[PDB]
Design an enzyme around this catalytic site. Structure first.
Site, PDB file in Angstrom:
ATOM      1  N   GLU A  48      35.129  40.669  38.853  1.00 50.53           N
ATOM      2  CA  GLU A  48      35.985  40.948  37.899  1.00 50.53           C
ATOM      3  C   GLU A  48      35.745  40.158  36.684  1.00 50.53           C
ATOM      4  O   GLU A  48      35.819  40.879  35.701  1.00 50.53           O
ATOM      5  CB  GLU A  48      37.537  40.814  38.654  1.00 50.53           C
ATOM      6  CG  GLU A  48      37.666  41.703  39.784  1.00 50.53           C
ATOM      7  CD  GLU A  48      39.322  41.707  40.118  1.00 50.53           C
ATOM      8  OE1 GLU A  48      39.940  40.861  40.328  1.00 50.53           O
ATOM      9  OE2 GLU A  48      39.709  42.926  40.140  1.00 50.53           O
ATOM     10  N   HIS A  86      36.652  41.220  45.624  1.00 43.46           N
ATOM     11  CA  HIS A  86      36.428  42.341  45.075  1.00 43.46           C
ATOM     12  C   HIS A  86      34.878  42.764  45.002  1.00 43.46           C
ATOM     13  O   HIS A  86      34.058  41.641  44.774  1.00 43.46           O
ATOM     14  CB  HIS A  86      36.843  42.429  43.528  1.00 43.46           C
ATOM     15  CG  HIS A  86      38.393  42.056  43.584  1.00 43.46           C
ATOM     16  ND1 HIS A  86      39.454  42.629  43.299  1.00 43.46           N
ATOM     17  CD2 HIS A  86      39.055  40.601  43.582  1.00 43.46           C
ATOM     18  CE1 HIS A  86      40.509  42.280  43.179  1.00 43.46           C
ATOM     19  NE2 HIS A  86      40.307  40.883  43.551  1.00 43.46           N
ATOM     20  N   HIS A 120      38.464  35.463  45.720  1.00 43.54           N
ATOM     21  CA  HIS A 120      39.612  34.853  45.037  1.00 43.54           C
ATOM     22  C   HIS A 120      40.411  34.284  46.222  1.00 43.54           C
ATOM     23  O   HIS A 120      40.762  34.780  47.397  1.00 43.54           O
ATOM     24  CB  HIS A 120      40.679  35.960  44.686  1.00 43.54           C
ATOM     25  CG  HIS A 120      40.009  36.601  43.359  1.00 43.54           C
ATOM     26  ND1 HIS A 120      40.420  37.698  42.810  1.00 43.54           N
ATOM     27  CD2 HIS A 120      39.183  36.149  42.404  1.00 43.54           C
ATOM     28  CE1 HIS A 120      39.976  38.066  41.696  1.00 43.54           C
ATOM     29  NE2 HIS A 120      39.080  36.955  41.463  1.00 43.54           N
ATOM     30  N   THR A 145      45.053  40.328  39.156  1.00 45.32           N
ATOM     31  CA  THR A 145      44.269  41.268  38.690  1.00 45.32           C
ATOM     32  C   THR A 145      44.663  42.715  39.401  1.00 45.32           C
ATOM     33  O   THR A 145      43.809  43.804  39.254  1.00 45.32           O
ATOM     34  CB  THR A 145      42.749  41.151  38.777  1.00 45.32           C
ATOM     35  OG1 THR A 145      42.655  41.127  40.333  1.00 45.32           O
ATOM     36  CG2 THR A 145      42.417  39.720  38.159  1.00 45.32           C
ATOM     37  N   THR A 146      45.445  42.594  40.226  1.00 47.89           N
ATOM     38  CA  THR A 146      46.164  43.681  40.767  1.00 47.89           C
ATOM     39  C   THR A 146      47.619  44.264  40.487  1.00 47.89           C
ATOM     40  O   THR A 146      48.294  43.180  40.190  1.00 47.89           O
ATOM     41  CB  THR A 146      46.032  43.958  42.293  1.00 47.89           C
ATOM     42  OG1 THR A 146      46.888  42.961  42.901  1.00 47.89           O
ATOM     43  CG2 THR A 146      44.615  43.672  42.714  1.00 47.89           C
ATOM     44  N   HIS A 204      40.768  36.854  49.550  1.00 46.20           N
ATOM     45  CA  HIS A 204      40.158  38.313  49.500  1.00 46.20           C
ATOM     46  C   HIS A 204      38.966  38.556  48.427  1.00 46.20           C
ATOM     47  O   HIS A 204      38.715  37.315  47.662  1.00 46.20           O
ATOM     48  CB  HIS A 204      41.165  39.313  49.295  1.00 46.20           C
ATOM     49  CG  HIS A 204      41.836  39.128  47.845  1.00 46.20           C
ATOM     50  ND1 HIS A 204      42.718  38.275  47.476  1.00 46.20           N
ATOM     51  CD2 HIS A 204      41.324  39.599  46.537  1.00 46.20           C
ATOM     52  CE1 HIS A 204      42.849  38.247  46.003  1.00 46.20           C
ATOM     53  NE2 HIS A 204      42.041  39.047  45.677  1.00 46.20           N
ATOM     54  N   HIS A 227      43.727  47.910  49.800  1.00 50.12           N
ATOM     55  CA  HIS A 227      42.736  47.674  48.283  1.00 50.12           C
ATOM     56  C   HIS A 227      41.738  46.762  48.520  1.00 50.12           C
ATOM     57  O   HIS A 227      40.607  46.922  47.873  1.00 50.12           O
ATOM     58  CB  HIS A 227      43.755  47.206  47.467  1.00 50.12           C
ATOM     59  CG  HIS A 227      45.289  47.818  47.460  1.00 50.12           C
ATOM     60  ND1 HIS A 227      45.108  49.234  46.848  1.00 50.12           N
ATOM     61  CD2 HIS A 227      46.397  47.441  47.812  1.00 50.12           C
ATOM     62  CE1 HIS A 227      46.470  49.525  46.596  1.00 50.12           C
ATOM     63  NE2 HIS A 227      47.290  48.486  47.318  1.00 50.12           N
TER      64      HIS A 227
HETATM   65  C1  LIG Z   1      52.960  39.879  43.877  1.00 49.35           C
HETATM   66  C2  LIG Z   1      52.310  40.247  45.276  1.00 49.35           C
HETATM   67  O1  LIG Z   1      50.608  39.727  45.564  1.00 49.35           O
HETATM   68  C3  LIG Z   1      49.791  40.128  44.869  1.00 49.35           C
HETATM   69  O2  LIG Z   1      50.217  41.550  44.071  1.00 49.35           O
HETATM   70  C4  LIG Z   1      48.451  39.828  45.058  1.00 49.35           C
HETATM   71  C5  LIG Z   1      48.434  38.434  45.112  1.00 49.35           C
HETATM   72  S1  LIG Z   1      46.715  37.823  44.614  1.00 49.35           S
HETATM   73  C6  LIG Z   1      46.563  39.308  43.560  1.00 49.35           C
HETATM   74  N1  LIG Z   1      45.543  39.521  42.901  1.00 49.35           N
HETATM   75  S2  LIG Z   1      44.304  38.819  42.420  1.00 49.35           S
HETATM   76  N2  LIG Z   1      43.203  39.611  42.507  1.00 49.35           N
HETATM   77  O3  LIG Z   1      44.465  38.393  41.023  1.00 49.35           O
HETATM   78  O4  LIG Z   1      44.184  37.697  43.431  1.00 49.35           O
HETATM   79  N3  LIG Z   1      47.795  40.182  43.966  1.00 49.35           N
HETATM   80 ZN   LIG Z   2      41.586  39.515  43.682  1.00 50.31          ZN
END
Ligand SMILES: CCOC(=O)[C@@H]1CS/C(=N\S(N)(=O)=O)N1
Ligand SMILES: [Zn+2]
EC number: 4.2.1.1
Length: 257
Positions: free
Chosen positions: A103, A93, A116, A195-196, A91, A61
């Site tokens: 985002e 985006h 992020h 956001t994922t 990470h 991703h």
């Molecule tokens: C619960 C497992 O961790 C995730 O699903 C990760 C942790 S940071 C994220 N999204 S973000 N882009 O908001 O940082 N997802």
């Molecule tokens: Zn992120």
């Protein structure tokens, strides 16, 4: 599984993750005129001098730079936060083109990318417990614009050839995330979500006002990564961003006048 394509992207996620249509989803558009200065905020305390990076991983991703979070080594405190939040990974985006990739948006403007830095609240003991709590995470978001190169990003760029495909990882010790920050710590903050998928509503978002500049060449190398695994049909890792979600019953606060 979930992804960013037409068949598995953000418009589909709600079928497996119904909180996608929840009351505090991220990202959002930051309307700068509507955001309000909050004198009750404090300055952000970003304490990264003892950070211990470990590894960089293509997870299919994005790519994550992971840190040792077994002790208070790299932490975020202050600002809107109560207590101490430990850095676990960062990470990005990014887009297929320089005019998209972030985002969050600022008065509907999209940046080329968004960094992020993900932290979890040490009062909950472990990341997995923290993401069951409404104040479990704090994510520091930093916009990237294309301009001059960011020197502190180049070690990331140079290792991406070794993690081209999903499931590949590489040693990434002794990386200093201080080199990814802009000069100013002025920020906007609001309560939101990952956001994922799983889109959990556990995040205090802290989005810096000042973007960092990265070079065209640096972001071009992000776009040579692959979403797919080795030996599978190549699908370039681009446009791995969720668009802005409804603000609903939230106010964005500004740390600056
Ligand atoms: C619960 C497992 O961790 C995730 O699903 C990760 C942790 S940071 C994220 N999204 S973000 N882009 O908001 O940082 N997802
Ligand atoms: Zn992120």
């Amino acid at each position: 599984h979930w992804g960013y394509g037409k068949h598995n992207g953000p418009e589909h996620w709600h079928k497996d993750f119904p909180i996608a249509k929840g009351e505090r989803q991220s990202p959002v558009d930051i309307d700068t005129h509507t955001a309000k200065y909050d004198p009750s905020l404090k300055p952000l305390s970003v304490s990264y001098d003892q950070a211990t990076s470990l590894r960089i991983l293509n997870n299919g991703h994005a790519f994550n730079v992971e840190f040792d979070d077994s002790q208070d080594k790299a932490v975020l405190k202050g600002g809107p936060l109560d207590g101490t939040y430990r850095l676990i990974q960062f990470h990005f985006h990014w887009g297929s083109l320089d005019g998209q990739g972030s985002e969050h948006t600022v008065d509907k403007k999209k940046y080329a990318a968004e960094l992020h830095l993900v932290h979890w609240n040490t009062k909950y003991g472990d990341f997995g417990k923290a993401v069951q709590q409404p104040d479990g995470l704090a994510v520091l978001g930093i916009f990237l614009k294309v301009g001059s190169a960011k020197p502190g990003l180049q070690k990331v760029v140079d290792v991406l050839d070794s993690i081209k495909t999903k499931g590949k990882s590489a040693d990434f010790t002794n990386f200093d995330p201080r080199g990814l920050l802009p000069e100013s710590l002025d920020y906007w903050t609001y309560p939101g979500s990952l956001t994922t998928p799983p889109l959990l509503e556990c995040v205090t978002w802290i989005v810096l006002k000042e973007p960092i500049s990265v070079s065209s060449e640096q972001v071009l190398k992000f776009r040579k990564l692959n979403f797919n695994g080795e030996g599978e049909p190549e699908e370039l890792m681009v446009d791995n961003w969720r668009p802005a979600q409804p603000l609903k019953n939230r106010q964005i606060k500004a740390s600056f006048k």
